[PDB]
C-alpha cells in the first residue's frame, strides 16, 4: 500500500509489517525512528511510530513485545545501534542478559522470556523443550528430559533393529593410560591399540600387553614374547568356554540372558586409505545366540558375568583349580592325606578365591 509514517507508496514486501500493530513502514522510517529512541529516548518509547499502539507501560505485554520486535530490529538497523538495544533492555527491563535460544531445527536464534518449558521458534513455528531442545511432544509433559529421551531412544525403530549390538558398543573401551574412550565392542582380538598414547592393553581386563623383555610379573614364563596377564574372569579366558557353560554360570546365579534377538551387526573399525570405516561384523548368527555371532554373543555373556562379578572358579574342576593355582599363586598344589577329590577341590577353591580376587580393572556393567 504505502508507509504509515511518511506515506511513501511501496509494495507490501518492500516494507516492514509491524507484528504488534500490523502497520506498514518503509525501511528508513523504521530504522530512523527506532534508532533515535534508542540513542535519545527510553526503551518504553520504542512503540510503533505510526500508532504507538504497543501499550508498553504495563509489564504484561512488555517482554513478549520486545522478544518479537528484536527480530525486526536485528534485520533493519546497524550493529552498535542494535547492541544499544540489548544494553538498554538489560539495564532497563531485565537486569540481566536476555535469554537467547537457538532453534535446533532451523538454526534461528530468538529471545525467549516466557514461563513455559516449551518454546515456539518464530521462524519454523515448531515447539521444543527449552532445556533439552528436543521437539516437544505431550509425552514430555510432566516428565523429566532424561525420561523423555530415554523414551524416544527406546521407541526408535532403527535403534531396536540394531539389537544387542547397541549394548556391546555402549559398553565402551576406555584406554587406561590416556583415558580415551571408544564406542567399540571388544570383538575377537583382545590386544587393543589406543591411538593417542599407542598404549597396548587387553580390552577385557585393561592389563598391559608387554613388549619383549618388558613384563615385570614374577615367574612369567613368556617374558621374551609379546603378551599380557589376565585375571581368571577376563574375556581372554572366558571366550574359550562354550556358550552353554557361560550360561551355566549365569543361571546358577539367576542372571537372565537373551538367546533370541530382542550377518552379525556389531560394528568394527576397518583401516581404509582415508581413515577408519565401520564394517559391520557380518559373521554368521547361529540359533540361540540372540542375533550376534558366537564371538560377540560370548562377549555379551561375559559382559553379564563381569557386571555381576560372577566367579568362574565356582565351576572349576580339579584340573582347572590346579592350573589356576600354578598361574595365580605360583605354586603347584598337592593333595593332602585323607583328602578325596571333592575335599581337594574345596581346598584349592578356598585358597584361590581368598588370595586372588577377580579382575580389579574389569568394567562391571
Amino acid at each position, epitope marked *: 500500500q504505502e508507509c504509515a509514517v511518511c506515506g511513501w507508496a511501496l509494495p507490501h514486501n518492500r516494507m516492514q509489517a509491524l507484528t504488534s500493530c500490523e502497520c506498514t513502514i518503509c525501511p528508513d522510517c523504521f530504522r530512523q525512528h527506532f534508532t533515535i529512541a534508542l540513542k535519545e529516548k527510553h526503551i518504553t518509547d520504542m512503540v510503533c511510530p505510526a500508532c504507538g499502539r504497543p501499550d508498553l507501560t504495563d509489564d504484561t505485554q512488555l517482554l513478549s513485545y520486545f522478544s518479537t520486535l528484536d527480530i525486526q530490529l536485528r534485520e533493519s538497523l546497524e550493529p552498535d545501534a542494535y547492541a544499544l538495544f540489548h544494553k538498554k533492555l538489560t539495564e532497563g527491563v531485565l537486569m540481566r542478559d536476555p535469554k537467547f535460544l*537457538w532453534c*535446533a531445527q*532451523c538454526s534461528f536464534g530468538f529471545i525467549y522470556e516466557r514461563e513455559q518449558l516449551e518454546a515456539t521458534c518464530p*521462524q519454523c513455528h515448531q515447539t521444543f523443550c527449552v532445556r533439552c531442545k528436543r521437539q516437544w511432544e505431550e509425552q514430555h509433559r510432566g516428565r523429566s528430559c532424561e525420561d523423555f529421551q530415554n523414551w524416544k531412544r527406546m521407541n526408535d525403530p532403527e535403534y531396536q533393529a540394531q539389537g544387542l549390538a547397541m549394548y556391546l558398543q555402549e559398553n565402551g573401551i576406555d584406554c587406561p593410560k590416556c583415558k580415551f574412550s571408544y564406542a567399540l565392542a571388544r570383538g575377537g582380538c583382545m590386544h587393543f591399540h589406543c591411538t593417542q598414547c599407542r598404549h597396548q592393553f587387553c580390552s577385557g581386563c585393561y592389563n598391559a600387553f608387554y613388549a619383549k623383555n618388558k613384563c615385570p610379573e614374577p615367574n612369567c614364563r613368556v617374558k621374551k614374547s609379546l603378551h599380557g596377564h589376565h585375571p581368571r574372569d577376563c574375556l581372554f579366558y572366558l571366550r574359550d568356554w562354550t556358550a552353554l557353560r557361560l550360561q551355566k554360570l549365569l543361571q546358577d546365579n539367576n542372571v537372565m540372558f537373551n538367546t533370541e534377538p530382542p550377518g552379525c551387526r556389531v560394528i568394527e573399525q576397518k583401516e581404509v586409505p582415508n581413515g577408519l570405516r*565401520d564394517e559391520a561384523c557380518g559373521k554368521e548368527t547361529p540359533a540361540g545366540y540372540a542375533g550376534l555371532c558366537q564371538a560377540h554373543y560370548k562377549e555379551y555373556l561375559v559382559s553379564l558375568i563381569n557386571a555381576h562379578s560372577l566367579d568362574p572358579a565356582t565351576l572349576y574342576e580339579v584340573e582347572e583349580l590346579e592350573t589356576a593355582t600354578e598361574r595365580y599363586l605360583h605354586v603347584r598344589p598337592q593333595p593332602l592325606a585323607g583328602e578325596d577329590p571333592p575335599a581337594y577341590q574345596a581346598r584349592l577353591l578356598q585358597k584361590l578365591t581368598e588370595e586372588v580376587p577377580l579382575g580389579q580393572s574389569i568394567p562391571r556393567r
Partner: nanobody, 119 residues
Framework: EVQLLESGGGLVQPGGSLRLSCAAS????????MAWVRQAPGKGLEWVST????????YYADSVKGRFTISRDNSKNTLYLQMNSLRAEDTAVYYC?????????????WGQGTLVTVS
C-alpha cells in the same frame, strides 16, 4: 568421535555448477539437523542452508535460495549442497555443521572446510 569431512570445492567460472558433499560419522546422523555455512575472504561467517533430520524441511539464506539445493542421504550419512549459477560473491570456504541440542549453540561441530573460488 564426531567427524565432518567436506569435499567438492574447487575453481568454477561464473554461471557454473558445483556439488559439495559432507561425510559424517561418530553420531546418529538421521537424528540431527545439518547445515552449510561459508566464510568469504575477509568477511564474517554466513549461514547458507539448513535441513531437518529426515530432510522434510529445508531453509535457505535469501542470497542463495533457488540457486542452491541442500539434501541428505541418511543411509550414507552424507549431506550435499548443489550449487548452481555460481557468482563471484559465492567465493568462500564452505563448512558443513551438525545441529545441536545442547544449550547455547545451534551447532556443536563444524568440518575442516572446502575452498570454493568462482572466477
Amino acid at each position: 568421535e564426531v567427524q565432518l569431512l567436506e569435499s567438492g570445492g574447487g575453481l568454477v567460472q561464473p554461471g557454473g555448477s558445483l556439488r559439495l558433499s559432507c561425510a559424517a560419522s561418530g553420531f546418529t546422523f538421521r537424528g540431527y539437523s545439518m547445515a552449510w555455512v561459508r566464510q568469504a575472504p575477509g568477511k564474517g561467517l554466513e549461514w547458507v542452508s539448513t535441513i531437518s533430520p529426515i530432510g522434510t524441511y529445508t531453509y535457505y539464506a535469501d542470497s542463495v535460495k533457488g540457486r542452491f539445493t541442500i539434501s541428505r542421504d541418511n543411509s550414507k550419512n552424507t549431506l550435499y549442497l548443489q550449487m548452481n549459477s555460481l557468482r563471484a560473491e559465492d567465493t568462500a570456504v564452505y563448512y558443513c555443521a551438525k545441529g545441536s541440542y545442547s544449550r547455547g549453540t545451534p551447532f556443536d561441530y563444524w568440518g575442516q572446510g572446502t575452498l570454493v573460488t568462482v572466477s
